[PDB]
């Protein structure tokens, strides 16, 4: 029953910044715990007993806190940095965790490489086509990928997915595939995928025709 | 060192029960408890409960001491949570976590995906994303994988059985109209290669033990 609260839920950093998360519950505890969890992979000990570095965790790394307020911080963020934190109180059943703090590092403006890929002669054969828009290592976040099928702008047709802020490079990168039967794909004959972002001047198209 | 090796992942139906596995290993397994974490896009992390393999006291998420039964088996270092009478809610992915009995959790396992549905499991088709020079932006080539229409959750993609790494992009699945899921592996390669150097994905797709590898060359 022990609620606890962490301020920032999502916070964006630049390097080397000092940025500090809290961690408030909803009565008072002996010890905080601090688990850092990258998506896909499981969490990792990072600092118990509120303010003991788990081994591993670098020493720009550090914990303070006292009954129910607690926070954690770390001196000058890096790339590696960029993850989920949760907070983790074992004082009484049942234990809890928080809601988690997610860290993006902040990088200089990034325009992404547009690629375009037709459909497969395999997938052909099964009846449907799928064309895909690479969108591949940008920054910021926001990026507006727009399929239009001989200039006709689609709607309703495409889904896209964006992987997670690298920590080598930090940039993002965006996966836009659009859908059609065999029979529309051709239909028609230009495909092209239309890319708006930060760091382009003007909006950039990849295309190609059927054949 | 410490290794928690769960059980791979489920495809489970609506009212059945089901049982995930820990495997420890590099640790005296009787010195410390077990415990069970629950991961949803729903609630984020829940502690289950644990189980002190020395005697078998448990302790319990009272939320979930019905749902959850937990039990031990020294001689091969493994403890089990069931989850009985399952529901779409407890779709989730499930951690073991070791802890001393005093202490806080400090290993975790890698974790099992569960699926709760009524719906048969689907393979994925592969399709390959050939490299054009529509795929060439300044002597860099980028090629990829397309896999499609498979259920449920997850699926593994590596490239030439995990000598390529660099430059390799596997993006989240999305969830298609059909209600099954689509995914997308892609590498930004060198163009002075793709005339000599293969690329081979792997797709392995668990719950229905479908395993592709499939050649991606240009045109």
């Known amino acids: 029953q022990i609620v606890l609260t962490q301020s920032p839920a999502i916070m964006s950093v630049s390097p080397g910044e000092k940025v500090t998360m809290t961690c408030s519950a909803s009565?008072?505890?002996?010890?905080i715990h601090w688990y850092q969890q990258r998506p896909g992979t499981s969490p990792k000990r990072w600092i118990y007993?509120?303010?003991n570095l788990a081994s591993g965790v670098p020493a720009r790394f550090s914990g303070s806190g006292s009954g129910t307020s607690y926070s954690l911080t770390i001196s000058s963020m890096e790339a590696e940095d960029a993850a989920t934190y949760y907070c983790?109180?074992?004082?009484?059943?049942?234990?809890?965790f928080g809601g988690g703090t997610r860290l993006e590092i902040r990088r200089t403006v990034a325009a992404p490489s547009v690629f375009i890929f037709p459909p497969s002669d395999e997938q052909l054969k099964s009846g449907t086509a799928s064309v895909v828009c690479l969108l591949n290592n940008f920054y910021p976040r926001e990026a507006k990928v727009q399929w239009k099928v001989d200039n006709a702008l689609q709607s309703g047709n495409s889904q896209e997915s964006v992987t997670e802020q690298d920590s080598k490079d930090s940039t993002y990168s965006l996966s836009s595939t659009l859908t059609l039967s065999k029979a529309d794909y051709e239909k028609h004959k230009v495909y092209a995928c239309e890319v708006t972002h930060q760091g382009l001047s003007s909006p950039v198209t990849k295309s190609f025709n059927r054949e | 060192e410490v290794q928690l090796q769960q059980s791979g992942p489920e495809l489970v139906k609506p009212g059945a029960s089901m049982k995930i596995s820990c495997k420890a290993s590099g640790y005296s397994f009787t010195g410390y408890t077990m415990n069970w974490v629950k991961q949803s896009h729903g609630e984020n992390l829940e502690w289950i409960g644990r189980?002190?393999?020395?005697?078998?006291?448990?302790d319990y998420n009272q939320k979930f001491k019905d749902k959850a039964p937990l039990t031990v088996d020294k001689s091969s270092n493994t403890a089990y949570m069931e989850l009985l009478s399952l529901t779409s809610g407890d779709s989730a992915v499930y951690y073991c976590?070791?802890?001393?009995?005093?202490?806080?959790?400090?290993?975790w396992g890698q974790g099992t995906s569960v699926t709760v549905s009524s719906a048969s499991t689907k393979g994925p088709s592969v399709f390959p994303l050939a490299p054009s020079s529509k795929s060439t932006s300044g002597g860099t080539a980028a090629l990829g994988c397309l896999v499609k229409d498979y259920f449920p959750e997850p699926v593994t993609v590596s490239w030439n059985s995990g000598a390529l790494t660099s430059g390799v992009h596997t993006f989240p699945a999305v969830l298609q109209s059909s209600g099954l899921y689509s995914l997308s592996s892609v590498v930004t390669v060198p163009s002075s290669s793709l005339g000599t150097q293969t690329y081979i994905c792997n797709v392995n797709h668990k719950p229905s033990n479908t395993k592709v590898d499939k050649k991606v060359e240009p045109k």
């Open positions: 189980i002190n393999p020395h005697n078998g006291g448990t």
């Open positions: 009565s008072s505890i002996r010890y």
């Open positions: 976590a070791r802890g001393y009995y005093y202490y806080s959790l400090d290993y």
């Open positions: 007993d509120t303010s």
């Open positions: 983790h109180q074992r004082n009484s059943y049942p234990w809890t």
